[PDB]
Design a protein around this nucleic acid. Structure first.
Ligand SMILES: [K+]
Ligand SMILES: [K+]
Ligand SMILES: [K+]
Ligand SMILES: [K+]
Ligand SMILES: [K+]
Ligand SMILES: [K+]
Ligand SMILES: [K+]
Ligand SMILES: [K+]
Ligand SMILES: [K+]
Ligand SMILES: [K+]
Ligand SMILES: [K+]
Ligand SMILES: [K+]
Ligand SMILES: [K+]
Ligand SMILES: [K+]
Ligand SMILES: [K+]
Ligand SMILES: [K+]
Ligand SMILES: [K+]
Ligand SMILES: [K+]
Ligand SMILES: [K+]
Ligand SMILES: [K+]
Ligand SMILES: [Mg+2]
Ligand SMILES: [Mg+2]
Ligand SMILES: [Mg+2]
Ligand SMILES: [Mg+2]
Ligand SMILES: [Mg+2]
Ligand SMILES: [Mg+2]
Ligand SMILES: [Mg+2]
Ligand SMILES: [Mg+2]
Ligand SMILES: [Zn+2]
Lengths: 68, 91, 134, 97, 245, 114
RNA sequence: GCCAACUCAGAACUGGUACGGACAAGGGGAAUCCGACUGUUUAAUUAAAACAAAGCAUUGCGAUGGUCCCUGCGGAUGUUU
RNA sequence: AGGAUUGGCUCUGAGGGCUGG
RNA sequence: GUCCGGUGCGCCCCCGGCGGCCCUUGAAAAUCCGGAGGACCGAGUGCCGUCCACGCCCGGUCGUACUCAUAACCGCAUCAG
RNA sequence: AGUCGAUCCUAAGGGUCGGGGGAACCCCGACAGAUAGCGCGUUUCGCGCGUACUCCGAAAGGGAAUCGGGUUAAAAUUCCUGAACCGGGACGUGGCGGUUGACGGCAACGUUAGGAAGUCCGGAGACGUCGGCGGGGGCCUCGGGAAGAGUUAUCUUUUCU
């Protein structure tokens, strides 16, 4: 597993073809976005829930999204 | 305090093997475990690695010497004889 | 007498260019405020010219006469002074101010390379242009 | 005697003991005479000789090892080489040539 | 009626030498043109201990005369040699301890070790710790040299035979008392299965001529014939004399 | 006080059968195989370790498994000889060549004189 | 100011003088013989004063050699001197 | 070789670390 | 809810660095990494290289239950060995 | 079962070609000898290197790679889920260099990349035993917070997990 520290890099990773699914976990103090790729699972941690909602809105239409 | 009157290093043998043999081996025990002057670096750091092998802890040079001393008595005589013969040949 | 002066050839003793030949450009015997130790600015050879022989073609001769140079400030203790001298003029090309930015360093290195290639093609200073073997 | 002159230099002259200081003086041209002991490593001795030749400075080979040179200098440590920056009351620089 | 221990030695399989940890044979370079006419320089890289051998061995690296590679050799170390020393082998090598020279170039009275018997055999004489050979005289007519071996015997060898200047290092080893059976056990553990030794008079008659009897005793002269068959040749073989000097 | 068992069919405590005790997220202790300690690259001249290279098993140095910067030192004889040894070699080469030139010129001068 | 550990040495008081309270755990001394010592041995009647041992001494041998194995060819000592 | 002591309870003394001019 | 601290000649394992011992100095190879040298090699809006990142496909054969012992082995046994 | 082993390597040693013996079964074992082959470019031919065994021999020596969680009446680091790694193959995209083969640091050295063939060199693998000291992981141990349980004629903010 690998951690992405930027929303921009997270979107770049999610845009590529081999991105299978996106999993969103709702923690008490932050929100985790997980993307399943061929080789690695990429996790982006967002401390503020507003930017988390904006990112969720910004997810590509063709990528499956699940809530945890 | 003076721990042993005369035994010194051979006190490790206790009361075994006889006084004469302990005295005889005392010389070797002292010599082989002592530090020797290093001609190459001018330090008293030459220690025996194995029988006949003497390495310097400081400069790292290793010398082939006596079994229990760095230099045997006959080594100096051999060096002198060889030097004399070489001088005669060169002259 | 002082010998660590400009135009004197030196051998780099440490760093990634250890063993390469270089020529002193500017000598700082007393150092500077940032460097209180004696150092100097040198222009050395990172890639020596290859062996040029008659049987090779003109293109091969031209390619094998190429030279690559580097500019570096080096502590006096990290160079070996030599008795050789290189008279290539680099005062206006290589200076401490050149190292301020990458572009200036590249331009100065290219100009010094051109001058060194010219001198090598002339045929003098054979020792300087042959790599040390060790 | 060389030892007496060295002692006089030590008690009344300027000097530096050691390889690094010797090289520093040779680079700065302050040294006027370099003394090298027999114990000195051959590579170090050759480098010191090359430096002295470049600087046009005389070199004297001490008739002893680093321990003997240090003892002659009046020090309790070994001296592989030394440089005479200024001989106060001695004339080694004049007698040796 | 049983094969005695001395007889069983020859078959081996328990009396073979223990050579697992040895560093290889110690010998000179193969005699070649450079050593026959000039000299070849080598550098001592290491002085090592050879298990089962009192004398230390020296690793010497030579530059191959006609190939682009290193020529590695293992010499019997002469006392006084050290790592980083330059070794010179050849007819024109200087007369200094550690150099290997043809006996023709070694003046009379010199001290040498690892002396060849046949030209090019790479050394068979005076190899043990503290041992040496002495050059006595040269015979230019027949090209032979006389040497004194460690045993005191005088031998004539061709003047082309090589020898290393000086005496073998490690001398004085045997002067130290062992004081205990364990030291002998350790000593012979790396040499061969020849220790401890059982006295013949302690055995039964079936396995030794000295065996048997209601008292411990040989019962007949311990001096035996030179031509006595194996199994009967025990004790003092072909003794010209016995007892103290 | 949980007591453990070997995870493999190796039942002897050899150098290649070393382990560590790790607590799993399941609340239990378990063994895990640990590689034998290996010395890193060493300088043959000084005998000291070569700086800048980690101490791993030989197969862990494989190019496909280790980054190039981790198994290289940017200097002549980098990763093989220490810095001091390389400096000594360079100085020795230069001085020996200079002395060879000096000997040659001295021989030429002597021949000219005679 | 806030924390920290079990070692040591003393002083009162006190019990039916019990208290290393079970457990755990040398009997000691004066001599003679043999073997110096540690070690080993008759698996299933002998553990010993027997064997070995370091130390001492003798004998053969410079490789075309000493000792030994092998029907023969060849081998062990020998990666030796 | 030969002598003395040893429990429980209540105390006393000695033997240290970190922080702050 | 799965939280916050202390303590150590404590016990098992691993590691580091010194010191003692040797007439004892205490394996080899597969494999992997690095280095010395530089024959030879390319273009101007594309060519030559690239141990970089990501992306793609595949990974054979045999063993794998259980006991491991006062009854799962040997001792003629579900034998105090 | 690509990840645990065998399988690979070699140890003491074993088995052999040729040669030498032997009536022969067989004996010695690389010792009496035109070695296996290995690299570069290719009209598949040329060039250059090439010291007579590229065989057997370790489920404790050396050694490519896997971890939790769960699951059966009986299997699991092998089955399920998730998340990794190793070896090999082939390409595509992007990036990197051309001062043809990067940059930075005085230096030790650092940065994910950052030429290269015959030839040569070093290291790791790779090593005894005993003693002290120090570091790490696991265990043991003391206190506080919370959850459950045990005792409660009396005491116990205490006993246990
Ligand atoms: K018989
Ligand atoms: K035996
Ligand atoms: K005996
Ligand atoms: K008898
Ligand atoms: K008798
Ligand atoms: K590095
Ligand atoms: K005992
Ligand atoms: K006994
Ligand atoms: K007994
Ligand atoms: K006996
Ligand atoms: K023989
Ligand atoms: K290279
Ligand atoms: K199984
Ligand atoms: K079993
Ligand atoms: K035949
Ligand atoms: K054979
Ligand atoms: K194995
Ligand atoms: K799993
Ligand atoms: K091993
Ligand atoms: K040790
Ligand atoms: Mg008797
Ligand atoms: Mg025969
Ligand atoms: Mg290169
Ligand atoms: Mg049966
Ligand atoms: Mg045949
Ligand atoms: Mg194979
Ligand atoms: Mg002990
Ligand atoms: Mg405890
Ligand atoms: Zn030294």
């Amino acid at each position: 597993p690998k951690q992405i520290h930027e929303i921009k890099d997270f979107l770049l990773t999610a845009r590529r073809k081999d991105a299978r699914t996106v999993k969103i976990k709702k923690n008490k103090d932050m929100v985790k976005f997980k993307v399943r790729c061929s080789k690695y699972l990429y996790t982006l941690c967002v401390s503020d829930f507003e930017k988390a909602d904006k990112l969720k809105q910004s997810l590509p239409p063709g990528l499956s999204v699940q809530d945890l | 305090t003076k721990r042993t009157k005369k035994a010194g290093i051979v006190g490790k043998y206790g009361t075994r093997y006889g006084a004469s043999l302990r005295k005889q081996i005392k010389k070797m025990e002292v010599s082989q475990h002592s530090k020797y002057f290093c001609e190459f670096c001018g330090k008293y750091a030459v220690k025996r690695k194995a029988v006949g092998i003497w390495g310097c802890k400081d400069c790292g040079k290793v010398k082939a010497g006596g079994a229990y001393t760095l230099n045997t008595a006959s080594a100096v005589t051999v060096r002198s004889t060889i030097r004399r013969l070489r001088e005669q040949t060169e002259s | 007498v002082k010998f660590l002066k400009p135009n004197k050839a030196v051998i780099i003793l440490q760093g990634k260019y250890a063993g390469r030949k270089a020529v002193i450009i500017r000598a700082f015997d007393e150092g500077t405020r940032d460097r209180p130790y004696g150092h100097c600015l040198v222009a050395g050879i990172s890639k020596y010219p290859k062996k040029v022989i008659r049987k090779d073609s003109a293109k091969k001769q031209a390619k094998k006469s190429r030279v690559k140079t580097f500019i570096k400030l080096v502590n006096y203790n990290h160079i070996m002074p030599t008795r050789y001298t290189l008279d290539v003029d680099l005062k206006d090309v290589v200076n401490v101010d050149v190292l301020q930015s990458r572009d200036k360093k590249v331009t100065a290195a290219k100009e010094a390379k051109a001058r060194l290639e010219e001198r090598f093609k002339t045929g003098k200073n054979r020792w300087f242009f042959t790599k040390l073997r060790f | 005697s060389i030892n007496n002159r060295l002692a006089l230099v030590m008690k009344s002259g300027k000097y530096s003991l050691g390889y690094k200081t010797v090289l520093k003086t040779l680079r700065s041209s302050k040294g006027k005479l370099i003394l090298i002991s027999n114990n000195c490593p051959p590579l170090r001795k050759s480098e010191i000789e090359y430096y002295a030749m470049l600087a046009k400075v005389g070199v004297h080979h001490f008739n002893g090892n680093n321990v003997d040179l240090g003892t002659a200098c009046g020090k309790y440590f070994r001296v592989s080489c030394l440089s005479i920056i200024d001989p106060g009351d001695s004339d080694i620089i004049k007698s040796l040539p | 009626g049983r094969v005695i221990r001395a007889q069983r030695k020859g078959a081996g399989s328990v009396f073979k030498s223990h050579t697992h940890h040895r560093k290889g044979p110690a010998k000179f370079r193969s005699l070649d043109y450079g050593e026959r006419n000039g000299y070849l320089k080598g550098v001592v890289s290491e002085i090592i201990h050879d298990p089962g051998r009192g004398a230390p061995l020296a690793r010497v690296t030579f530059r191959h005369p006609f190939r682009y590679k290193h020529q590695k050799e293992l010499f019997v170390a002469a006392e006084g040699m050290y790592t980083g020393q330059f070794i010179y082998c050849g007819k024109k090598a200087n007369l200094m301890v550690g150099n290997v020279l043809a006996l023709r170039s070694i003046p009379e009275g010199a001290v040498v070790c690892n002396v060849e018997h046949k030209v090019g055999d790479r050394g068979v004489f005076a190899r043990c710790s503290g041992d040496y050979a002495i050059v006595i005289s040269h015979n230019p007519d027949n090209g032979t040299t006389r040497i004194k071996l460690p045993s005191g015997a005088k031998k004539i060898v061709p003047s082309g035979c090589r020898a290393m200047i000086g005496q073998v290092a490690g001398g004085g080893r045997t002067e130290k008392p062992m004081l205990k059976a364990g030291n002998a056990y350790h000593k012979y553990r790396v040499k061969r299965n020849c220790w401890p030794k059982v006295r013949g008079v302690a055995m039964n008659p079936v396995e030794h001529p000295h065996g048997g009897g209601n008292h411990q005793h040989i019962g007949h002269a311990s001096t035996v014939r030179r031509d006595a068959p194996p199994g009967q040749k025990v004790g003092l073989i072909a003794a010209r004399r016995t007892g103290r000097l | 006080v949980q007591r453990l068992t070997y995870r493999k069919r190796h039942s002897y405590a050899t150098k290649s059968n070393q382990h560590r005790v790790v607590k799993t997220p399941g609340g239990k202790l378990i063994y895990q195989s640990t590689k034998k300690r290996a010395s890193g690259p060493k300088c043959p001249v000084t005998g000291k370790r070569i700086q800048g290279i980690p101490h791993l098993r030989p197969t862990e140095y494989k190019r496909s498994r280790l980054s190039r910067n981790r198994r290289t030192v940017n200097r002549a004889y980098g990763g093989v000889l220490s810095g001091s040894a390389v400096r000594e070699r360079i100085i020795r080469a230069f001085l020996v060549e200079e002395q060879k030139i000096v000997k040659k010129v001295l021989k030429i001068q002597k021949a000219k004189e005679k």
